[PDB]
Design a protein around this ligand. Structure first.
Ligand SMILES: [K+]
Ligand SMILES: [K+]
Ligand SMILES: [K+]
Ligand SMILES: [Mg+2]
Ligand SMILES: [Mg+2]
Ligand SMILES: [Mg+2]
Ligand SMILES: [Mg+2]
Ligand SMILES: [Mg+2]
Lengths: 122, 81, 77, 200, 118
RNA sequence: GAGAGUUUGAUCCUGGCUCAGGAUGAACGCUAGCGAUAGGCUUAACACAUGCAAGUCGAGGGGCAGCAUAUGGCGACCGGCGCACGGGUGCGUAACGCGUAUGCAACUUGCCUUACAGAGGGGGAUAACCCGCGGACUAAAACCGCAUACACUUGUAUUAUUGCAUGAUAUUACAAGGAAAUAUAGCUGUAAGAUAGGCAUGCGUCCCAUUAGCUUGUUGGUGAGGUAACGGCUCACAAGGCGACGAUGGGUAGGGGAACUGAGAGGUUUAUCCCCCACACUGGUACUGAGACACGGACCAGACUCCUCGGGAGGCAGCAGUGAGGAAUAUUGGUCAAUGGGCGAGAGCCUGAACCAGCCAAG
RNA sequence: UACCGUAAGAAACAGCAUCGGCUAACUCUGCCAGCAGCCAUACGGAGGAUGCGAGCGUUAUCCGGAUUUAUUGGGUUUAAAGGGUGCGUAGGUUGUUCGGUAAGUCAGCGGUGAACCUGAGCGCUCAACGUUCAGCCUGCCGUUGAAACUGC
């Protein structure tokens, strides 16, 4: 544009959006599991992923992926939800923090223990 | 030894008031961002006891105490008609 | 805590009495017409206003304003 | 913190016996682990820069945060960045003690400094990272001038040939003349690689 | 009233004071009219830096010093009536010569012998 | 002042996206030795119990319950000074509120300093005490006259100088009017200084025009009243004023210096620190005072809460408990030894300011 | 500060197919995952190795590369992007020359603008930090000059 055009109007800047908006800028949130179900990945991936419908304290519905081998989650279980989205799964943009509140650590883990909330073996 | 009250030079824009006139002072300066020199004006309200000013005359005004609600200037001299 | 309440109330009554007296005197003087009588009652009212300003019920500038106005009126009858 | 691990592993990994002279470096010139001496896979230029940085760090006993701060100091200072970095590394109190020969190894010098057997300008200084300036005097503490380890280390060190260090055996002390040039410093560290790695 | 006092400005365990001229209602480390010196009580000589002319001017116009500020001013020699003399002139107090009084008191040094003959 | 990947069978472009780097008052998982020095409810101007946080003066007065034979001192009362600061919070506010630069010939200013004058006489109350809520007695540096101030205020006149229009200053006055405290350090008037406020200005100060007209004390004048002070600030002719250089309305926000970040331009936020503003359960009104949005004052109206049958209390945005909310943030701790503050002649008293200690992967 | 007698009381966390620094065995949908993607130099365990280190990882938020709002510093035939075409209001821009003015512009002088941040020290045994001094004031205001260019 011309200098006169920019004087008249100017430039416009647009703020970005959060990748995980249901956290409300909190690093984690507390929630209650509505339904703990199993889902299918996209076309090039075949598995049975474990997902949970979680009602956060700020009255928001989220789909949170439960990581690790096996879980003890059921309905009406208090869990901690953090950010992070799985690629093949569509609409699942949150993770359950293992080893906190109701959800326990992954049993039998020896490597990457801190990512799955597993205590150091004796 | 006075403290040199503010003074302005402007052009009369209205005189349809009892002993009060409107003086428009215009100037140019660069834009804070784009650097182009732009025009802006500022209006005033001055006291003229003798009502000796018309419209468009170039006048000089001085800052005074509040003489009314939004009237803080007086007419010192007339430079042009 | 009641000491402040009592002192404030006593001082409020004390100030109000003298302030009202001075205001009534000023109002009565403002309505006079006889120049000689006005000149005869001006000094006592000036004394009252100045004593009030000294006691700090009113401000010295307020007393000065009132005295100036009343002297101007007495000049113009 | 300190490395306090095995030393022959680092010596064999880097080839050069940076921790002095050892009998293990012969008949074993491979990096540790079961995958050693299996040819030599092509390591990138970044890998070479990283290995040079690690060689300097293991040589002088400096951890990564302190090393980065030393690089920042060299960058702020006036002169060649790499030469200044090597000068700052050599100006540490434990390195100065080791060059004076009071202790056999740099780790021994650090242990003596920490355990307060070294005095700087007549006062006890026990910070191993203390930066020695030219004109200062570093000597054995008077209460520990008859230590068996110190006496053994000084036995046979009658050379004291370092040009930038003046040794006085009568006072059991030494002084630093000036900052030596990088070519005078006897270390095989290529400071240029560390400089580009830390600046890129 | 206007006062001469100290603002604590060092760190924990090491107090350093800034000798300022401030209104009494101001916060201790807050607003100040002017800064006239500094005071370090950690050193045994009790380090003092002061602007003599400005301190004398503030005392003249009537700033009231605190106890420690008054002691500092007396030590520096601001508190004098040599200017108050209406019957004399050029009355050189020369008390700075006696106020020098250099206390070069040191401590003897002793050493422990190392009898490690083994 | 430098990055990488990713649309294709392969290529060159355009274009968004995702990862590398730095930072946090962070939180979470695993793990944990010390020292130093920082920081510690970011969620609601949420709710509770207990304690503390602003008192001091017996060199002001009557007195004397706690002691030596009123004197050591001191509960209460009258009186002086202080509590408007220190400390806490960010609701509100798009505004001369804030920043920067000025003006007041339109201003006020306790305590402090200096200079010039003066501290002469007198009167009446009512706290406490005493007798029953009502009555009686009495003192002061409490309150109030009279006398003297011609340094002050008001009015008039004269002279001289002068400015920026209203005007300002300085000699001459005559006239009227205005003060004080004593005890073992003080008091009153005036002027100057210092300090602290107030008012008014130039410029800068977020989005929406799917907000284009707004305004009737509103714009100016005359006069009066009022104020520390100018002024539609208020009250009894003319029709003007503001507006695409964005009026009006709506939404959002305390504002700066810092801090962080980037080669710079610039961008983000004002956590701790400093300055200014606003506020003290929500509104309204004032009183006292040098000074008031009155933060440990009052009255009224609301709502909420508590304890009691006539009613009476509280406000946790001062410091520590606790509860709740939350991903998440500590002791119902010590001392006035230092610095600062209030009062006191001083010694001194008080100080949840402050200085410290305790707790917390903790920068 | 000094003396007893003591290695004694004190290391974990995340990676290891490429980008990226690091390797082979045993298991096997369970999974992993920033991307290329992998159901094994990528999943789980074992042995080793590589970062860092009283910390190491994950999530959240902000900034830079990002020139992805481009005054400095981007574009519009076909990638997003020329109004269907004119006339015309406000606004923006204005051939050549002479003479004034001094609004923009230029220059000089003066005032104004804690802590933090930059060279030099000094004190914290070092360092963070604290403190002093030199170098920034590179904005605003006032007052004197200049007249090439823009404005009148
Ligand atoms: K008062
Ligand atoms: K104290
Ligand atoms: K032209
Ligand atoms: Mg009298
Ligand atoms: Mg009042
Ligand atoms: Mg460390
Ligand atoms: Mg197209
Ligand atoms: Mg066309």
């Amino acid at each position: 544009p011309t200098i006169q055009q920019l004087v008249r109007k100017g430039r416009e800047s647009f703020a970005d959006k959060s990748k995980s908006p249901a956290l409300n800028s909190c690093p984690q949130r507390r929630g209650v599991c509505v339904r703990v179900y199993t889902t299918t990945p996209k076309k090039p991936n075949s598995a049975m992923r474990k997902v949970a419908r979680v009602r956060l304290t700020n009255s928001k519905e989220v789909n949170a992926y439960i990581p690790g081998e096996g879980h003890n989650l059921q309905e009406h279980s208090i869990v901690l939800v953090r950010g992070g989205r799985v690629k093949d799964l569509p609409g699942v943009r949150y993770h359950i923090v293992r080893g906190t509140l109701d959800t326990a650590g992954v049993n039998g883990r020896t490597q990457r223990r801190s990512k799955y909330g597993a205590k150091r073996p004796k | 030894e006075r403290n040199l009250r503010k003074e302005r030079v402007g052009v009369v824009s209205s005189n349809k008031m009892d002993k009060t006139i409107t003086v428009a002072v215009k100037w140019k300066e660069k834009h804070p961002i784009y650097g182009k020199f732009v025009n802006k004006t500022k209006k005033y309200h001055a006291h003229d006891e003798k009502n000796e000013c018309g419209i468009g005359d170039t006048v000089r005004i001085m800052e005074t105490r509040p003489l009314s609600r939004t009237k803080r200037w007086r007419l010192t001299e007339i430079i042009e008609r | 805590s009641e000491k402040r309440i009592r002192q404030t109330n006593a001082r409020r009554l004390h100030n109000r009495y003298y302030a009202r007296t001075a205001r009534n005197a000023v109002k009565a003087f403002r309505a006079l017409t006889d120049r000689t009588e006005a000149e005869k009652k001006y000094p006592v009212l000036a004394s009252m206003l100045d004593r009030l300003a000294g006691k700090n019920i009113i401000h010295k500038n307020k007393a000065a304003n009132l005295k100036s106005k009343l002297a101007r009126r007495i000049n113009t009858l | 913190a300190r490395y306090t691990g095995p030393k022959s592993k680092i010596a064999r990994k880097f080839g050069d016996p940076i921790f002095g002279a050892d009998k293990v470096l012969s008949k074993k010139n491979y990096p540790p682990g079961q995958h050693g001496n299996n040819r030599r896979r092509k390591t990138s230029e970044y890998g070479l820069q990283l290995r040079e940085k690690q060689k300097a760090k293991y040589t002088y006993g400096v951890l990564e945060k302190q090393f980065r701060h030393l690089f920042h100091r060299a960058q702020r200072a006036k002169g060649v960045t790499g030469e200044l970095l090597i000068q700052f590394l050599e100006a540490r109190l434990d390195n100065v003690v080791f060059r004076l020969g009071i202790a056999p190894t740099r780790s021994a010098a650090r242990q003596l400094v920490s355990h307060r057997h070294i005095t700087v300008d007549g006062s006890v200084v026990n910070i191993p990272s203390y930066s020695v300036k030219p004109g200062q005097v570093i000597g054995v503490r008077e209460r520990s001038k008859s230590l068996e380890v110190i006496a053994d280390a000084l036995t046979g060190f009658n050379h004291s040939k370092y040009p930038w260090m003046e040794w006085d055996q009568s006072s059991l002390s030494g002084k630093l003349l000036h900052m030596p040039d990088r070519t005078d410093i006897p270390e095989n560290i290529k400071e240029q690689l560390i400089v580009e790695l830390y600046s890129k | 009233a206007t006062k001469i006092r100290l603002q604590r400005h060092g760190r924990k365990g090491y107090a350093f004071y800034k000798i300022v001229v401030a209104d009494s209602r101001a916060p201790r480390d807050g607003k100040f009219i002017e800064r006239i010196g500094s005071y370090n009580p950690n050193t045994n000589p009790a380090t003092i830096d002061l602007n003599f002319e400005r301190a004398l001017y503030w005392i003249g116009v009537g700033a009231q010093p605190t106890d420690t500020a008054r002691n500092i001013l007396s030590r520096e020699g601001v508190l004098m009536m040599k200017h108050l003399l209406g019957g004399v002139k050029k009355g050189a107090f020369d008390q700075a010569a006696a106020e020098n009084k250099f206390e070069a008191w040191l401590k003897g040094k002793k050493d422990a012998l190392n009898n490690m003959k083994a």
